[PDB]
Amino acid sequence: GNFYAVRKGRETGIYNTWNECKNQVDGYGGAIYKKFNSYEQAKSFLG
Secondary structure (H helix, E strand, C coil), X not given: CEEXXXXXXXXXXXXXXXXXXXXXXXXXXXXXXXXXXCHHXXXXXXX
């Protein structure tokens, strides 16, 4: 899968999986989720 700096709402945060990816954001009419491939960038994004 991949890494995901997600935080649209609810228990979220950075992910690192195929499921965590689509699972945390699958369909989402317009979720925020900041896709990433390195918690270092995704985390640097979260602030």
